[PDB]
Symmetry: D2
Subunit: 458 residues, 4 copies
């Protein structure tokens, strides 16, 4: 059993000093003097905050790339998540047009199975819609996966055409599934990439211009129109800039059931990072690209008002040696920045401690809303009797810095090297079991489990 | 002591089956199968929801009109509120330019003292800014009133000119006060009023065109600009229409600390009700006016996304005989529609039961966010250990209709006559004491207390 | 030679009383009291306006539908045009995906050759992009056709997918060609069509909801984004509604070289006309559909400010018997409304005589700007020495009504039956030769010539 | 008499090679071989363009400032205008709240009378609306002044309050008068000025922050609302930035009869100029302030599409010694930048020659539209038989630079020092009389006359 005593409990809709007792995997009682039994593991949260475990709706653990693979395993990625206060992650399951979807699902599941320190689930990529698709997706959804992922990008590999998007969305609606979507334009990006390379513009600084804000804005609007016409519910992944936010907001305002995620690098990093030349720039190549810094205030301001629903990472780690596969052409740089371990600390620090983000909006944006949208609430995402005992005792007196020298992610650079932090998770629990204590990793191999969900969005 | 057992507890961020025990005035413990001392008021909430007491941030109880007065007293109004599931109301304290501000506040405070069945507080109207009034306002703030009310309307009686508005906002920011604001344009309303009357256009149907959406849009944008330049935090009361929403939203999007209230008649009633002729139309005269029905969808959609932060009533009850003071000129009709008792049932029915509003957004919009914004949280607005035991056991199986024949508000008409509802409160408590039991009123005279709040917005 | 004396000359940028003399085909001199050789056709324009011949940038003359054809020939259509004050028309040359593009152009050219009473040119439809067609298009351009037409609609028959659209735009930019575009969404229209029919919703009233404003908005935004990325110049044909206007306007505001056409039925007719049932409704079926009447004000207001650049017709005449090919399914109704003869009188009446449209904006929107955009200026579109002596002596004192009983278009209904008009052409000339005299047709068969234009938009 | 032969005549709606003959003050004939009489002054325009005389709708000649006066007289200012190709200017007649309006009008008229080299007129400032105003304004308007000027700025000196603005606009509408307006906010600017000075922020770099874009956007929207409510027609002077353009465009789109002027410094200069320190910065202090450079593309793009109707200068010259009156406080820097002589050359060069502005839009924006809006067309603003023979023979082969060393404005600095030009006026005529020949000044003292106009906008 677990007793977290003397802490200040903070959720999206509560802030109070009381103790929390969990007999086993779920919270059993909250109050004063709980009378825990002999043998209970007791955590003294005096002077600290007790938050719901944080939830990252957007990560990449297993991911092939051209001739290689991203760096985290389920083991290394879940450890890194927990150290950062993230107790549930949702991975993009990404079979390509060339792969069988159901085989893909099964392959991802097999990688994670028994190998995660914390709970997890998947969004299912629909990278084509052919005569076999519907039956396979129906099997995946009935297996507990209540979200799809589509790409309006990556022509012939992940992108879906308008007919396929229509079919996907109509099936999602019939199934109650939420459609997450990467919103660019496959044709425009591919053509601009090719034109730029044909002019000898090969370095990393041409990535951003190959897929400018206008392209993300067109795809975000297109997705919204297709949700509106089909009746499906959707979720825009990694929204990066003002034109896209305007398109998604206009859809929200007119009644489209559309939600918005932004990811941490777009709040804190900007397009000049990718203008640094060489491998230093390649570290900062992701899609959508880092943008003009003017977009940061726009995202922060929108987050503070709840216009942006969730904050994820689009965690996608590669070693510098892998980055350098793009030395001759920017199109060959594996895209991604790592961030799974640093999301909470970065949001707390630059939002709550130094910014204008309210602590309640912070909990909602980094835990609760994502749980709600993806069918993990109320098991996950809050602090209440009956919910999973996934808890973070957070130290607001902690001062430090982020660095690759102290990170757990299985690569060789940190995207926030040298950034100051104003707090950290002291203790982190997964279903009543302590996985981080005094800031140190003490997780149990395979303790995490796949979360199966019931579709909600008919 | 109080024990609410076997209910499904629903807050803005939680949903679970457990019991709640309050030894006295505040929640003491939450857990499954709690024990309570003999003699405890045990409430069996099987099959029902348990919500935080709802909170109406915008009512009028005492309010002079010519040589009469709005109809509810603190006693009638607070009883009505409770019957409807509202356990805290915030009343607009409204001395005019021709009244002394401190004498007005003391008069309002004197009316409520010992006469409310539930807790309450005030927003202080600033109907002029000058040396005496400023000193007055400073003492009112120190007495725990942490919000002001200004009017961009009602020239020479309640409205403030630009200099007054700037001075008011600056003072609010000095004092950490949030400014609530009625946003029209005092000049344009008065000129259109006078023009229409000059044309013999005297009937109630001319009230809306005397103050069209354009004027609300301008006032809302003006207020936002003033908040933006002064640094003050503000709250748009009773936002009724799309052009006003667009103005407020643009301000939110660019970082102004501005929040949005809408009131229940603007969700459910439309301008044609005020076109019915005679006293029947007069029943539906309020400011801002009921609008073209197209605005309802706009408001519901914005509410579902959290763009609108709170739902209040602008409760302002008059008898039909008093409405008829305006028989000869629409400008002489006492403005207002009653709604304090019906808000929660209406929002629950048309939003949650029949609409697209999520139950969690419902709780946030009808209780929690108002508590947060006005300094009542966490005492009010949520269910957590330590919070005032202001609770509603709500029956989602109730079916019925609203009628003047069954209302508690002390006037002779209901604006929502005949409207179906899909739920009602069964039990309602105030600080651990049951005020409504099995749908019957059992409140204790004067049990409610004035809530004093601390400055939050420096 | 021709002498038009004593008229009030009105162009987009001039308004004066003087005479115009043309020795032959072109304006030779302008001045007060000009002398002309004996035998001159002297036209006394006292009391009347003299305008540049009007120019319709969007008509259909030859157009197959199933095993029939739209009703006007080049002879009937050009006569109708002239009677209405239109001295140049631009016809959409529309071979389908299943037709050879060059054979289509040669067929269209062959239909018009020697059969037009006034000058004319074409926009070339690109209904597919592939190696053969591209070569074809290049020869058509070289023959003087400096505009293309694409369709974001009509899947598999006329529409282009994204790759085709990008290739088309890129070719246009290479060749200095302007792309005109019908902006809907081919997927969404086809799916909604099929869904509605599956529900037994077969009548004409289901045509509008099969292709709602949302779909036009999406296509207009998509086209704009494609122009923006390709560098091509473009022109939105028949823009019908506010959300489409907003998309096109946002593109204009951010610098895209995009222009906007609206057509006369969308100014004056609304969706309820297509809700009349039966053949009566079928008369009013066109694409994009007639819209909610709220859009009329939007279009008039935008026209008065020059936000809409040109007014055309989308003239596309069918007999009622042909409309009835759609008796069993709205998808089988031949789309189109006639208007070539009535455009100018309608715009003049409802805009200038009765509305808020300035006479100078009228001339620009109905003649000059179309000439500019399509490479016909300064030969066409204005009154100046050197310009083709294509002139309209317009009687602003005429009062009458439009009727099928008096029309020249070769079908059996007028969409504007009974509409009042407040002016008509008295005299109309084509290259110095009078075609309409005292309101009577006196044109010379085959006098009109194909206009060849030079590339302008590299 | 005057004959301009061999030129390429370019107006907003014509481009052709022909000759122009004027017997006296107006164009008499246009054609080839005009047969001018003995004694005619002949201008050989071979290889050059012939444009309508350009028109500056916004200048300051006589203008008091705190204890001094702007530098141009009617003599020096009109000479400078003509050298730059501007043959008509419209001066802001600016009596303050402390002055009698009719006395002001009379004073301005007396300064100009007999002292201008070219034609001119005034906009009448309405700096208060009291019991004498209406009669005085009615006398001014009946004297030929068909435009007013109002200020939403300069509290207690030029600014009008909402009641005064309402009265002004309603009288304008009754009279058919167009209301030009400086759109900021008097309260916000004054309060921010004072706050900044109170913090020791005194240098010129604090001017822009004292009246940021948001304030211009609020005033532009307010003005638009008041035009919409009163029914008056308006014209936004010197619109400088995107937020303001958005407000004015939204009003245009919804049907408000509102027009937009921008002035040349806001196309070509930016806020960093005023950050240079010292008198160098003070040279670039005007109101509205130079803005972030991002606004330039926004204005150019809007101009190219006709969203911005006119280009003026807000010519307002002061010597550097006068600028230095603001050495201790930025509020004491006389505001203004000179530009009357350089407007055309700057627009031609950076718009037509090096930019994307079409030559027709250039003529419209710099001549024709302003003539139309202010009742000077068709006497002024175009090239047609009967119009005043105000003509510019412009040399497109001229290459040079702008400098104070070669300027005619009666001050000691040029705001475009060192800017390259790609053309210049070779010959300029006023009502048939040559005022500039071979680029040299040959004007006749007092040849210019006051233009009286008939109101148009009821
Ligand atoms: Zn992605
Ligand atoms: Zn991703
Ligand atoms: Zn109010
Ligand atoms: Zn109120
Ligand atoms: Zn079409
Ligand atoms: Zn067409
Ligand atoms: Zn000004
Ligand atoms: Zn000025």
């Amino acid at each position: 059993p677990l007793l977290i005593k003397n802490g200040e409990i903070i959720t999206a809709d509560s802030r109070y000093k009381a103790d929390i007792y969990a007999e086993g995997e779920t919270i059993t009682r909250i109050g004063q003097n709980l009378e825990a039994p002999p043998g209970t593991e007791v955590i003294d949260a005096t002077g600290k905050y007790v938050f719901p475990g944080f939830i990252d709706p957007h990560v990449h653990i297993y991911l092939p790339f051209m001739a290689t693979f991203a760096k985290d395993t389920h083991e290394t990625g879940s450890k890194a998540a927990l150290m950062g206060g993230t107790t549930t992650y949702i991975e993009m399951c990404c079979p390509s047009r060339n792969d069988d979807a159901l085989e893909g699902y099964q392959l991802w599941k097999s990688k994670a199975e028994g190998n995660s320190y914390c709970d997890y689930t998947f969004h299912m990529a629909v990278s084509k819609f052919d005569e076999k698709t519907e039956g396979q997706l129906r099997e995946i959804v009935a297996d507990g996966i209540s979200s799809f992922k589509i790409f309006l990008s990556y022509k012939n590999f992940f992108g879906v055409d308008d007919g396929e998007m229509y079919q996907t969305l109509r099936l999602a609606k019939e199934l109650g599934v939420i459609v997450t979507a990467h919103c660019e334009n496959a044709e425009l990006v591919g053509r601009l990439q090719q034109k730029l390379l044909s002019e000898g513009k090969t370095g990393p600084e041409w990535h951003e211009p190959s897929r400018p804000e206008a392209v993300e804005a067109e795809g975000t609007a297109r997705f919204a129109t297709f949700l509106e016409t089909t009746g499906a519910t959707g979720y825009v992944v990694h929204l990066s800039c003002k034109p896209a936010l305007d398109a998604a907001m206009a859809a929200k305002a007119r009644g489209v059931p559309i939600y918005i995620e932004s990811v941490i690098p777009h709040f804190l990093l900007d397009k000049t990072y990718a203008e640094r030349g060489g491998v230093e720039a390649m570290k900062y190549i992701m899609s959508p690209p880092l943008r003009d810094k003017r977009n940061q205030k726009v995202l922060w301001d929108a987050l503070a008002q709840g216009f942006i629903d969730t904050v994820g990472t689009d965690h996608c780690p590669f070693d510098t040696e892998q980055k350098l596969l793009g030395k001759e052409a920017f199109t060959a740089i594996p895209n991604g920045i790592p961030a799974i371990e640093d999301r909470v600390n970065l949001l707390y620090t630059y939002g709550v401690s130094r910014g204008r983000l309210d602590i309640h909006r912070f909990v909602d944006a980094a835990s609760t809303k994502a749980a709600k949208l993806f069918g993990l609430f109320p098991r996950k995402g809050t602090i209440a009797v009956g919910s999973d005992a996934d808890l973070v005792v957070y130290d607001p007196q902690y001062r430090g810095t982020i660095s690759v020298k102290t990170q757990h992610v299985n690569n060789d650079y940190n995207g926030f090297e040298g950034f100051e932090i104003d707090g950290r998770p002291s203790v982190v629990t997964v279903r009543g079991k302590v996985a981080v204590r005094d800031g140190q990793f003490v997780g149990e191999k395979g303790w995490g489990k796949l979360l199966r969900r019931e579709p909600m969005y008919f």
